[PDB]
Amino acid sequence: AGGQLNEFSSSGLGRAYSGEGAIADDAGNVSRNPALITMFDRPTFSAGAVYIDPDVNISGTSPSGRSLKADNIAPTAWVPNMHFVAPINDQFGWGASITSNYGLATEFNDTYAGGSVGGTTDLETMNLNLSGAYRLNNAWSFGLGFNAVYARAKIERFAGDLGQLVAGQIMQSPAGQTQQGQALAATANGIDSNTKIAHLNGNQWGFGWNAGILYELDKNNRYALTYRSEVKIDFKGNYSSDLNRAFNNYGLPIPTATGGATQSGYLTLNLPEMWEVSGYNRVDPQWAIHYSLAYTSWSQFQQLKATSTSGDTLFQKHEGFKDAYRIALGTTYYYDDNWTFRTGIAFDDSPVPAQNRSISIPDQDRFWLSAGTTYAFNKDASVDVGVSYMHGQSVKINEGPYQFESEGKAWLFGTNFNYAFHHHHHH
Ligand SMILES: CCCCCCCCOCCOCCOCCOCCO
Ligand SMILES: CCCCCCCCOCCOCCOCCOCCO
Ligand SMILES: CCCCCCCCOCCOCCOCCOCCO
Ligand SMILES: CCCCCCCCOCCOCCOCCOCCO
Ligand SMILES: [Ca+2]
Numbered sequence: 001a002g003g004q005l006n007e008f009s010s011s012g013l014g015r016a017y018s019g020e021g022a023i024a025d026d027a028g029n030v031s032r033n034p035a036l037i038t039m040f041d042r043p044t045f046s047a048g049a050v051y052i053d054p055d056v057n058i059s060g061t062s063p064s065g066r067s068l069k070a071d072n073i074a075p076t077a078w079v080p081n082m083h084f085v086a087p088i089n090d091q092f093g094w095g096a097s098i099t100s101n102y103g104l105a106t107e108f109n110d111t112y113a114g115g116s117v118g119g120t121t122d123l124e125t126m127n128l129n130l131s132g133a134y135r136l137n138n139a140w141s142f143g144l145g146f147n148a149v150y151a152r153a154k155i156e157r158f159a160g161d162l163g164q165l166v167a168g169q170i171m172q173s174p175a176g177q178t179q180q181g182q183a184l185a186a187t188a189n190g191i192d193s194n195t196k197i198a199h200l201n202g203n204q205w206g207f208g209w210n211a212g213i214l215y216e217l218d219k220n221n222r223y224a225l226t227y228r229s230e231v232k233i234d235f236k237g238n239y240s241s242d243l244n245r246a247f248n249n250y251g252l253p254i255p256t257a258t259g260g261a262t263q264s265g266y267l268t269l270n271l272p273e274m275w276e277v278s279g280y281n282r283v284d285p286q287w288a289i290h291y292s293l294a295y296t297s298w299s300q301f302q303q304l305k306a307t308s309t310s311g312d313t314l315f316q317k318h319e320g321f322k323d324a325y326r327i328a329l330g331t332t333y334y335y336d337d338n339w340t341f342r343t344g345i346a347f348d349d350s351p352v353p354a355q356n357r358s359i360s361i362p363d364q365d366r367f368w369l370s371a372g373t374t375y376a377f378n379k380d381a382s383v384d385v386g387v388s389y390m391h392g393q394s395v396k397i398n399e400g401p402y403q404f405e406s407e408g409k410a411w412l413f414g415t416n417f418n419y420a421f422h423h424h425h426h427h
Contacts (some may be wrong), residue, residue: 001300002351003104003123004323004361006273007050007079008032008097010414013386016344016371018289019329021212021224021278025332025340025374026384026418027083030095030131033226033318034143035214037133042423043086048384048416052077055360056106056408058114064161064168065115068404073118073362075105081416085097087425089158100124101228102151102271106360110194115160116254117399120286121199121360122154125271129210141214147207151233151269155200155315155360157255159243163194165401168382193244195343198255198315200306202237208271220282230300231271239265239306239314249288253400255315256308265306265314272300272321286334294326298351324351330370340374342386357397362406364392380420388412 005019009028021034024039026035027046052078060068086093102125131145166188175181175335208231216222243257276294283289298321330344346368352361372386394407 001236001324001326001348002301003102003105003361004274004296005079005100005415007052007081008081008099009046009073009384010048010050010386010416011342011372011374011384012341013050013388013412013414014344014370014384015330016328016330016346016368016370016388017289018294018344018346019278019292021226021276021292022214022222023278023288023290026382027085027095027418028081028416031081031083031084031097031099031129033212033214033224034095034131034145034277035212035224037085037095037131037143038094038135038141038214040085040368041087041241043084043421044418045084045420046416046418047080047082048414049078049080050386050414052079052410052412054408054410056406058359058362058406059405060402060404062113062161063401064113064164066161067112068402070112070114070118073106073108075107077103077105079103088427089425091135093133097127097129099127099129101127104361105425106362109160111163113193114159114404115158115193116162116197116400117157117309117359117402118160119157119360120154123151124153125151125247125295131210131401139216141216143212143214145210147206147210147231149206149233149271150203150407151206151235152203153269155198156196157198158189158193159191159195159197160193162254165383190244197241197243197257199240200214200237200315202235202265202266202267204233204235204282204380206231206233208269211277222280224276224278224280226276228274230273230297231272233269235267237265237267239308240260241376251346267304267306269304270300270345272297273397288332288334290328290332291329293329295323298337299323299325301351303422304347318356319361320353321351322353324349328368333390334401338376340376341393342370342372344368346370354395357395359397359400359404359406362408364395364406364408366390366392380422382418384416384418386414400404
């Protein structure tokens with residue numbers, strides 16, 4: 001939740017990402033737990049993508065009387081994944097992957113009446129991971145990984161109906177009868193709803209590490225603990241606002257006006273650390289259950305704040321997230337040599353306290369329902385197909401001069417192809 005993504009594989013999608021630190025039926029899980037490397041005795045490849053089709057809607061009425069209805073404010077997304085794992089020795093192995101652990105997109109029409117808190121909010125990240133692992137004995141394995149994260153981000157906000165609202169208050173006040181107030185009201189009326197009042201964009205790399213432990217009770221039952229470090233992205237990018245500079249320094253609740261001029265802006269984005277415990281139990285030749293609890297330190301994300309080369313605040317939005325958990329439970333039906341089926345459910349606690357909710361990050365507690373299948377063409381190759389349905393609760397949002405309600409759900413569809421090489425690294 002809150003911009004965190006779980007879509008590292010399509011088999012995982014069909015499980016509702018349950019017990020992902022503890023299952024190693026394909027190469028995708030190494031990205032989640034590097035210790036799982038020790039479960040692979042030949043070079044193994046997996047690649048695919050998950051298509052996310054959100055349906056997130058906003059409703060309400062502005063004090064101007066304009067509707068705050070906004071349908072489908074969360075664009076579709078295509079999240080790819082690629083994974084490779086290989087033994088080095090009977091005791092060591094390595095793996096690498098390309099995945100995305102964080103990403104968000106919320107995009108309103110630029111004439112939206114609530115544009116000052118709407119507009120566009122986009123974050124895309126690509127996690128490049130290189131991992132290694134060591135098997136201590138039949139029971140214990142340990143893994144460590146290095147992550148290089150590339151992030152591209154953009155925020156835009158627009159005037160919306162603020163100009164109309166301000167003109168209305170001026171004209172209803174004693175100032176409405178003065179030359180000064182009338183001049184200000186004309187200026188306020190002149191601010192078109194699609195006037196850009198903030199633009200931030202930048203691209204940057206950050207770095208992190210991750211680690212895992214695997215405990216195998218036997219070949220059919222294992223448990224895992226993993227940690228993914230925080231990743232700090234220190235963007236240096238562009239900031240501008242098309243409002244006249246004369247708007248500045250009155251304490252108005254709008255971003256810094258720059259008369260359309262671009263200047264360098266700095267913003268630090270913290271991608272939060274995450275812990276996860278997982279279990280996998282193959283209770284029968286044809287059946288396994290798998291389950292997990294994850295804890296994400298979303299308290300590490302406190303605000304979006306862009307500052308200038310003089311250290312002044314250009315744009316600032318308080319977020320105040322809280323640490324949050326995700327719990328998931330799934331089962332896998334190993335039907336025959338070709339067919340495997342799976343299903344799962346999960347609950348994702350929103351890291352956003354009610355008072356801190358915003359329409360640009362329209363988040364809510366989410367429930368997952370998942371189903372999937374894998375067809376193995378032979379001992380070396382297979383395809384995974386997965387589908388998930390996510391449903392969140394409708395919530396009230398109070399932001400700036402506006403009151404909104406938000407509702408959200410999503411469909412997710414994923415396909416992966418898997419290939420294992422006829423190749424061993426024994427000594
Ligand atoms: C004119 C385009 C940019 C807007 C200039 C600054 C706008 C900041 O003011 C906040 C707008 O809020 C509207 C004020 O509503 C009238 C006051 O009474 C309503 C409070 O309940
Ligand atoms: C992409 C390759 C496979 C396509 C999967 C898409 C979903 C279609 O499969 C639905 C489930 O079909 C069940 C198969 O029935 C079991 C096979 O029966 C043979 C046993 O003798
Ligand atoms: C409840 C919604 C919050 C909106 C208003 C809350 C109280 C703020 O009103 C302060 C009044 O200050 C008046 C200044 O208005 C801006 C005029 O400048 C725009 C001229 O272009
Ligand atoms: C290609 C590298 C980056 C991966 C693409 C991600 C682009 C940003 O979009 C993130 C996808 O998430 C969209 C919303 O997620 C579903 C939550 O909304 C549904 C409400 O239940
Ligand atoms: Ca080799």
